[PDB]
Every structure is written in C-alpha cells, then in structure tokens.
Design a protein around this ligand. Structure first.
Ligand SMILES: O=C(O)/C=C1\SC(=O)NC1=O
Ligand SMILES: [Zn+2]
Ligand SMILES: [Zn+2]
Lengths: 193, 194
C-alpha cells in the first residue's frame, strides 16, 4: 500500500483549495472539516501547491488514488469497464487511469511495473509572479457511484513532491467524491457533523 | 439462474418516473407510488420515464425484461400464453412469444438470450425530448396477468437496465406490473389493502 503520511519536508509543502462554497452551480468544492474534495466527472478540479521555499530544478508532482478503507486498500483504483471504453481520450492519458491533468503537454502517466498502481506526474512550476501557490487542474474520469470501478467506495488522492530521481520531498492527501452535485453533496455530508 | 433486480442508480443517477395519470376508468396505464406497481391494459401505451443526473454517451441502450416476483416462480421465463402467442397482432419486429414490446420505435431490438432463454426488448437511449426533463419509452404488455397457461395471476416485475454500446451495466431499476381490464379500479383496490 502507498504511504499517505503527511510530510511538509524541507520546502514547507502543503495543499490549498478554492473557497468555493456549496451553491448548486459549483463544479468543484473542498470541505475543510472532512478534508474532502467534491467534484464532477471530467471537470476542472483545481489543487494548489503551497511551499515556503522553491523546490530545486526538475522537481515533479505526482497524483495517485487509493481506496480509503483498510479492506479495499490493496485494490488498484482504476476506471470501470464502461469509462475505460468511452471515447473521452485526450491523446495523453491511459484509458484505465482515474486521474488526468488537463492543460499541461508535459504530463506523464505511469503503470507501476511492480505495484500496477496508476499515477500522473507533471514538472513542478513555481507560482506565476505575484501569486502564492501553483495550481494543477486535475480531472477525475469515473464517478464514485460507478459499478465495476470504485462502486461507492471512498478514495484518497495522494499528492507527492519528488526530486528528478523520484526521491520523496513532500506528501499530502485528501478524500475525493466524484458526484453530479458537489455543492449539495458537500452541504448534506457536513450536516451529519 | 435469475437476472439481478437490485436497484443501481450508477454513474448517470438513473431513476424511473411515471405519469401522474390517476385512476379514472379511461386510463390505460397508471402507476402506484405506494406499491411501486404499474397497472395497465393489454397492448395499450405504457409510458416509462428515464431520469438521469447526467446525459449518458451516444450508443447507450435501454433494456426491459419481465421476471416473476415470487421466489418459487423466479427461474421460470415470463412469456405470453398460447392464445396470445397465436393472436394475429404482429408488428413485424416483436417475436410472438415476447410479453413486452416497444411501440413507435423502428430501432427496437428483441433478444432471446442463447443461455438463459429470457426475453428482453432494447432501444437506443435518446436525451430528453423538447418540453420534458426525462426520456419516455412507450411499452406494450401483450398478455394479461390473469391469462391461464401464461402468468396465470402470478405477479411480475419489469427490470429496466441502462447499458453502454459494449453491453456494460450503467444502471438498473424495477417496478411490479399488473396487466388487467380496469387498471384504475385495480390500483384503488390494491392500495385499499394498505
Ligand atoms: O387477435 C386474437 O385472436 C387474440 C387477441 S388480440 C388481443 O389483444 N387479445 C386477444 O384475445
Ligand atoms: Zn466509471
Ligand atoms: Zn395471454
């Protein structure tokens, strides 16, 4: 099982999210209380990288999904047979991969040769001049409710900062529900608190 | 074997809807929300609504299949009685043995499962028509619930499955059906017992 241990490391690495609220219109919304992203199938999911100091040249940013529950943790998170077969290809992402990056031609996809785990990795870019974080646009290409895939099992996304050799510089994670109405679903889930 | 009747809204938030038709003597098809049961007349239009949270892709298909509701009858294939099988009511498309037809759709496809021998009818999924928030399929039930040598008063379920162009299951819903002479009266009577 991949480690989900939070690690700010030398560069003070943590994640940020847009403060989007729970209006019906929202495409993507993050719950601080639940540490949970609510997002729509194949829609922009902004994830912010915050550092106290610039990581070195060739630093990379990897995203990987795991099942949150102990009893499912060893099962590779992948798209359902249906979504794997859909003609929704961007010409870059493998059809089995849940997590894509949109708007980055330097994106790289891995099928791990030992663990069979899927991940997507981009070069780390510092913030645009006058900005305090780096934004990556993730797309989740299966719904949480898909039979043959996640089938309502909650997942975590693990974001790792690595050097050009793959050495760990930093790690953070958040729960993800891919759903039709993130706004309503977030508000409903926070009601139970 | 027995086809699954387990409700599955799945990726597209798939639910069934029915017209709020009431129980006047003139109604040909009326649904009881309390019983989740359709009452309809032999060979008459039965609107079944498909509700989705998101539009399934092109090539999506919608399948209807009848199974007996009671455990002791579940393994028996639901088919028309000898009399109705021999009625000259053919539309050129539906096999004469099939209980469930679709009317007004030249893209309708009928299956005799080579392994289970189960009957099903499938149509292309189309997005909701103008003035509607759902997709309506017009089903016809071609044998009465009371028919001796067929269902013979045994209650049936219709299972509606949403599948992609490759036959992957996207969603499943079901409802009980009674095919009868006076659906309105029979709905009132069966709701009285609540
Ligand atoms: O046409 C026939 O000879 C038999 C049929 S047609 C129909 O709907 N009901 C009947 O008893
Ligand atoms: Zn899926
Ligand atoms: Zn009959």
């Amino acid at each position: 099982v991949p480690s989900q241990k939070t690690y700010q490391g030398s560069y003070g690495f943590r994640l940020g999210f847009l403060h989007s609220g729970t209006a019906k219109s929202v495409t993507c919304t993050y719950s601080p209380a639940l540490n949970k992203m609510f997002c729509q199938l194949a829609k922009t999911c902004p994830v912010q990288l915050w550092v106290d100091s610039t990581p070195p040249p060739g630093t990379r940013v990897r995203a990987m999904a795991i099942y949150k529950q102990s009893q499912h943790m060893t099962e590779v998170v992948r798209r359902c047979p249906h979504h794997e077969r859909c003609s929704d290809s961007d010409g870059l992402a493998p059809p089995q991969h849940l997590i894509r990056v949109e708007g980055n031609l330097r994106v790289e996809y891995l099928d791990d040769r030992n663990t069979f785990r899927h991940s997507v990795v981009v070069p780390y870019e510092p913030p645009e001049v006058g900005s305090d974080c780096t934004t990556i646009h993730y797309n989740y290409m299966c719904n949480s409710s898909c039979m043959g895939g996640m089938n309502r099992r909650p997942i975590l996304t693990i974001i790792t900062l690595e050097d050009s050799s793959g050495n760990l510089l930093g790690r953070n994670s958040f729960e993800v529900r891919v759903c039709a109405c993130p706004g309503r679903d977030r508000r409903t889930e926070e009601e139970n608190l």
